[PDB]
Symmetry: D2
């Protein structure tokens, strides 16, 4: 499934309908995915992953310079599933940045997939170490003409081609205290520029 599809015509939500940090009022255009909807979708992703790969030990890999926050929530949800199974399932968690992967189930966790080049490159590397199974979970997949066409195994949301921030998605180290996925405004785009 392509996940939750936010279409190009869907405007999103007015900033006034949800709680927003006041220091970002002029910095955001609109709210795409409230923090609460991200959690509800992420909980479902954890069940899809466990149903498909969680039978035994997995290696979950967070791609650095990315969405550590989404890796953390997804692993929280996975742990809750394991916490109510009858088996004690071990689990390796590591962080990768672009040897013991061989023979194991590898889940790669990314926060956003824009062009898809990063993930396209990462998989070639991981697959040269020949693992039994390598799957990718991405919170957001952006619909962009700049995309090479890659399709993650597990997709939280499919969003229009807009620059988004909040939850896991910083912008020059700002916006990590924003828990909703919003579209950045030109005022904010230039305010926190580097």
């Amino acid at each position: 499934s392509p996940g939750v599809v936010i279409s190009d015509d869907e405007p999103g939500y007015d900033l006034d309908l949800f709680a927003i940090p006041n220091h970002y009022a002029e910095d955001l255009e609109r709210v795409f995915i409230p923090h609460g909807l991200i959690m509800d979708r992420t909980e479902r992703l954890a069940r899809d992953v466990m149903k498909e790969m969680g039978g035994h030990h997995i290696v979950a890999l967070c791609v650095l310079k990315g969405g550590y926050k989404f890796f953390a929530d997804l692993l929280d949800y996975i742990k809750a599933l394991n916490r109510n199974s009858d088996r004690s399932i071990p689990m390796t968690v590591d962080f990768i940045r672009l040897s013991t992967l061989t023979g194991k189930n590898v889940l790669i966790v990314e926060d956003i997939i824009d062009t898809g080049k990063t993930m396209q490159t990462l998989l070639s590397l991981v697959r040269q170490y020949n693992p039994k199974m390598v799957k990718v979970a991405s919170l957001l997949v952006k619909r962009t003409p700049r995309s090479v066409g890659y399709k993650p195994d597990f997709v939280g949301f499919e969003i229009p081609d807009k620059f988004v921030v909040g939850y896991a998605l910083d912008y020059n180290e700002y916006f990590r205290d924003l828990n909703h996925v919003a579209v950045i405004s030109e005022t904010g785009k230039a305010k926190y520029k580097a």
Copy 2:
């Protein structure tokens, strides 16, 4: 405002996109409002309450029956605002089914407004005990044609005229354990028909 508006043409969410209890698979048609999204709206709703009624001792009245979950969540967010206020703020809670209110800010918390006759009756009575102020917060407002035209002060979501269950909204004491607000199915109403 009318709250978060859910239009008649928006289908909703497919059930496979979120975690729903297995035994309710065939009892639902669509997820309108995931649990996490309810929470986001309710947090802002609480900020709106303290903005209009934070100036006097508030009495929070939960309308029975079947509207208690939203009440607890809303008060949790209100209390979190008072504990950040740097002042000792007293607050009264109470439950009401069809003398302290005198001179206080009275918040009538309702889960669903359909015909609006319930809230119409209650307001007329509550105003008799000459409160400083009477406002109604409602999680859901149904666009039902049988509406006598009453608009509450704080609305979570304005939704189509569909029979909805989940989060706070039960049906013959069923669906309490469902956290999302979903439309019931024909199988749903028949199976659990009292």
Copy 3:
């Protein structure tokens, strides 16, 4: 079991080890149970309830006087258990203060038991209607020489004979926004005296 026993030797927890609202700094002596501990114990209480009341429809009964918060948290953990039972489980919730109890398992939920005379009185009236079973769940049971000897079926915490506030336990409508169970100070009990 007697529950989680907090002995008279234990001074609880220094106030500065936890987040307590600043306006309550001088109004408290010590923290007995942090909010997080309450929740973890309450989750286990929900299991113990289902283990010996899960065979028949439950009527959950909240005694009006303060236990609403703890009622809500206990019910949420019950609902989580049912969510994962792969069975549609109906449940009634009502409120009681100082008829359809014909023959279902009645669960009376209380925040605190001091002398025990309230529970003794209530159980005498409820058993008159001849329910299948009546059980009592209390968050706190005080170790008090004033006790009439009533011990509930499920106990969260057995504490020393001190006047506690926070979480579900208000004091003349004050301390609602306090999340932890803390001992009130003499300066605090005078400051908010009714």
Copy 4:
């Protein structure tokens, strides 16, 4: 302060008082720190951190391969604080396994400090790069005569010198789904030695 001190005489909690995954029933002896109590303390630590060094931009370093769970949670609380600060506070989140730090407020986050040889070493490296200041937050400090004497700047819990698992503390990648800090049993010690 040495944090929350768990005495050598303290037995911890009987496993029957809290929700414990069934597959670990025989693998644990006692519970020292329920998950919720960890959170309540970690929330206080986030406030101590921000008051002391959170006025400006901080670099948060998680030490791998330790307790990313604690790192993620301490940072969730930090973000919640910044989210109400009325200022856009930038933050750097990085990981390290044992020049951009120069002139920055550097917080090292560790799950457990046993002998202290890791922090002693880590601090000597970081201090060569001339940060504006470097501080250590550790969830658990073990009271052990194997200790080289290092005491972190922020301590969650000072615990006896026993082998603990749960919450961010794994044993050969097991116990990652256990959310309480419990003492492993000698059975569990050799069951997962792998």
